[PDB]
Amino acid sequence: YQPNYFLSIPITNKKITAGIKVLQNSILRQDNRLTKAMVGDGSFHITLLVMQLLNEDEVNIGTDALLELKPFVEEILEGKHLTLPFHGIGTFQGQVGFVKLADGDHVSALLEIAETAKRTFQEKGILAGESRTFKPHLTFMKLSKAPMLWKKGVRKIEPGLYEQFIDHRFGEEILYQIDLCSMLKKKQSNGYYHCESSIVIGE
Numbered sequence: 001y002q003p004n005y006f007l008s009i010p011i012t013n014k015k016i017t018a019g020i021k022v023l024q025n026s027i028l029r030q031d032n033r034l035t036k037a038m039v040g041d042g043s044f045h046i047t048l049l050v051m052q053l054l055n056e057d058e059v060n061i062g063t064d065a066l067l068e069l070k071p072f073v074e075e076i077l078e079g080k081h082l083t084l085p086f087h088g089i090g091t092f093q094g095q096v097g098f099v100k101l102a103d104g105d106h107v108s109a110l111l112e113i114a115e116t117a118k119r120t121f122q123e124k125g126i127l128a129g130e131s132r133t134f135k136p137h138l139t140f141m142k143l144s145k146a147p148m149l150w151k152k153g154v155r156k157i158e159p160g161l162y163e164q165f166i167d168h169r170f171g172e173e174i175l176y177q178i179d180l181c182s183m184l185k186k187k188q189s190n191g192y193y194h195c196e197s198s199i200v201i202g203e
């Protein structure tokens with residue numbers, strides 16, 4: 001199915017987003033027509049769960065399900081913060097560029113949170129989650145965002161473009177806020193997705 005909503009972990013560590021800005025700019029000085037492929041300032045996030053919310057009631061139901069999820073995430077973390085280290089760069093078939101989530105104990109915990117999120121939402125009547133493997137990543141560019149690129153010979157992200165950032169430590173994000181975000185609504189003033197509601201997992 002086509003999702004229109006998602007649970008989002010926003011990137012709040014300014015060092016991470018500043019490092020990505022540098023990466024994006026270095027790519028652009030090499031090839032400036034990649035401008036519209038870059039994800040917008042202020043939009044950086046990890047997608048935790050996708051879903052469909054198709055009316056006002058369902059948007060309210062999503063918000064309820066997010067609230068209900070909070071204690072579950074607290075249970076899962078067992079008194080330790082979840083730290084997500086962002087290191088290196090990867091692509092999905094040369095069309096989507098992303099900062100990689102480093103391997104570690106956090107990946108399994110994150111996956112557990114994603115599956116518990118999927119269950120919590122479905123038990124409230126929300127079509128959520130996917131059948132494909134959860135592979136969290138921090139997107140910085142998508143060629144699909146700039147349709148004219150095909151139309152003029154740019155049909156893959158040149159791996160040389162981000163060569164210098166291949167083993168760049170962008171930084172670490174501690175899980176705290178989880179946002180319920182609209183994919184299709186107008187973005188916030190600061191560049192972030194439209195947010196229906198948020199919880200904090202935190203403190």
